[PDB]
Amino acid sequence: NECISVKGRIYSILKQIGSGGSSKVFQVLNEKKQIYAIKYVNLEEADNQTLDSYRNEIAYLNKLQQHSDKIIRLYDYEITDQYIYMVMECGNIDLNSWLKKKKSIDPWERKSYWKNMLEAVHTIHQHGIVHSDLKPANFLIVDGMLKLIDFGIANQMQPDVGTVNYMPPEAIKDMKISPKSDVWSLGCILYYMTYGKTPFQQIINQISKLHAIIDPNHEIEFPDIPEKDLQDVLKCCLKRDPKQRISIPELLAHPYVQI
Ligand SMILES: CNC(=O)c1ccc(Nc2nc(OC3CCCC3)c3c(-c4ccc5nc(C)oc5c4)c[nH]c3n2)c(OC)c1
Ligand SMILES: C[As](C)(=O)[O-]
């Protein structure tokens, strides 16, 4: 029977649906029995690099959210020295959880989702943000459109160890990073949605997998399919050289989404 003020308004906690370092997410209801998500962050052992990174996501999320409804809707927020509360639209499920469940994947639905992902990533690119670690859990389903819910500015949040399967090959060759890197990661999300597995899912051993990713002579298999346009989008996304790899503006003019 627990409850939360944000800016005056009192929200009744249904269940918790996410948790991270200091962070919890809750499905909640206002007085009027309407549903929301509230991200709570606990600032009590947080150093200034952590605090500034949080301040940054809020600032950017607030701004970005008015240029696209493919970015999550942030309704309001509270921030003190001890905590952060962020009230936002509640989604049905995160994309990752839904891909694991879903055996079959409907061609038209796949295309609506691709477009949603493109519009989102395109948005952040326009405002200077290169995520470079996109994966399915970064997106929510909210009335059958995907919405971006993380921006690679602060600790990734777990739906109540993470993969390396979506990692771009320049991430691994560093250690100035390109927006292309996002094209790779979306390329992989589409590849899963196309063929039901990610390109290197079968290589369980991680160092092997990283090698395969960064190896130009490790060919990625593209089984033929009815949508010969989709086959091309996967082929252009998953080029290891960022220079030859396709761009988002290019992707938005591509036949897979346009014809
Ligand atoms: C196994 N998991 C499930 O079944 C499930 C997952 C998400 C639900 N809804 C939801 N899950 C969310 O965040 C998740 C936790 C981290 C990833 C998802 C959000 C968020 C959200 C959560 C955290 C965020 N951080 C930022 C910068 O933006 C955020 C937005 C807004 N609405 C949401 N709505 C859900 O319905 C209750 C069920
Ligand atoms: C905006 As781009 C050229 O990294 O897809």
UniProtKB/Swiss-Prot annotation:
Lineage top rank: taxon: Eukaryota
Tissue: Present in rapidly proliferating cell lines.
Binding site for ATP: 17-25, 39
Protein kinase domain residues: 11-257
Active site, UniProt feature: 133 (proton acceptor)
Subunit and partners: Interacts with TPR; the interactions occurs in a microtubule-independent manner. Interacts with MAD1L1 and MAD2L1.
Role of this protein: Involved in mitotic spindle assembly checkpoint signaling, a process that delays anaphase until chromosomes are bioriented on the spindle, and in the repair of incorrect mitotic kinetochore-spindle microtubule attachments. Phosphorylates MAD1L1 to promote the mitotic spindle assembly checkpoint. Phosphorylates CDCA8/Borealin leading to enhanced AURKB activity at the kinetochore. Phosphorylates SKA3 at 'Ser-34' leading to dissociation of the SKA complex from microtubules and destabilization of microtubule-kinetochore attachments. Phosphorylates KNL1, KNTC1 and autophosphorylates.
Family statement drawn from the similarity comment of this UniProt entry: Belongs to the protein kinase superfamily. Ser/Thr protein kinase family.
Name the UniProt record assigns to this protein: Dual specificity protein kinase TTK
Gene (name only): TTK
Residue numbers of the full-length protein present here: 515 to 793 of 857
